[PDB]
Amino acid sequence: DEEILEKLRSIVSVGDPKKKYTRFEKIGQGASGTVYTAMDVATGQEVAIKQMNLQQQPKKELIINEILVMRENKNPNIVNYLDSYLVGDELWVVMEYLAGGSLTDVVTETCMDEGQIAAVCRECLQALEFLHSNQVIHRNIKSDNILLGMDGSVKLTDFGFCAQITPEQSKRSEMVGTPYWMAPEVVTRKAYGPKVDIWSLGIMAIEMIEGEPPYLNENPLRALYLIATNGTPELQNPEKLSAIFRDFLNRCLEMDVEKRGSAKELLQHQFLKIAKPLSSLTPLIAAAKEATKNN
């Protein structure tokens, strides 16, 4: 549909971003595109720019949807959308820069304590409570999509996979996500709702405990099969966790969706009573940056 393409072309700003920004440094490179920091020639502001190759995404309505959801759902625990450009066959999305980097680096290079985990979970649940109240389901919660500020701020990004629900159509049915983090109702193609995000948050808490989601060593298709057959995953060493942390995990990773916590309910879970102030996260940031400086 050259209808879709024309809507994309009219959403973006015009001008050359290679002259509106400068000092490009590559900081990441997924299949979803390459990420650079840069500086706004006009403002001084540091920004993150995500370069997304269009020919990779045949369903352009997903790109539109990403930008539209981001601009419409502003929140302190969500990375801010700034602007977008079309540079030939690539879309550039300009976002606020968080200099503390990804929770992925923290969970792979450090051992978080329960108080720090509680703090991260509480900020993530705040983001989810906001989204879900606005009838938005993220569908791609994972450590990779949590960014940290140098003050210990915690923010969600990546609306590339999200869905909007209504009272008329309250459930989705697309098998979308990143396998290791996907709820069993999504993997097995049942109708599902916002609590799929809660499941994925539970898997992210397992990342913070163990360094990886369950089954990361397996290929993605095998991981889907394991999720379909095991349901609620097992920890390598459950006994090292507090009872209240175990209770929280169990409520996030309940097989029965009615029983699984909502974000609003999980914000009042006993485990969050031990959350530390966000300043407690700045040492993890320092450690992660030290560990990854020489990659």
Ligand X SMILES: N#CC1(C(=O)N[C@]23C[C@](Nc4cncc(Nc5ncc(C6CC6)s5)n4)(C2)C3)CNC1
| 172 contacts: CB under 8 Å, gap ≥ 6 | 137, 139, 163, 165, 191, 192, 193
Closest separation in Å from C-beta 224 to ligand X: 20
Q: For ligand X, which residue has the nearest CB?
A: 28
First-to-last alpha carbon distance for the chain, in angstroms, is 43
Q: What's the chain's Rg over C-alpha atoms?
A: 19
Closest separation in Å from C-beta 263 to ligand X: 21
Closest separation in Å from C-beta 282 to ligand X: 14
* Residue closer to ligand X, measured from CB, 147 or 198: 147
| 110 contacts: CB under 8 Å, gap ≥ 6 | 284, 287, 288, 291
* Residue closer to ligand X, measured from CB, 79 or 203: 79
Closest separation in Å from C-beta 260 to ligand X: 26
- String of DSSP letters for 10-45: HHSB-S-HHHHEEEEEEEEEETTEEEEEEEETTT--
* Residue closer to ligand X, measured from CB, 48 or 187: 48
Residues that bind ligand X (CB under 6 A): 27-28, 30, 32-33, 35, 48, 50, 79, 95, 97-99, 101-102, 144, 147, 157
* Residue closer to ligand X, measured from CB, 73 or 188: 73
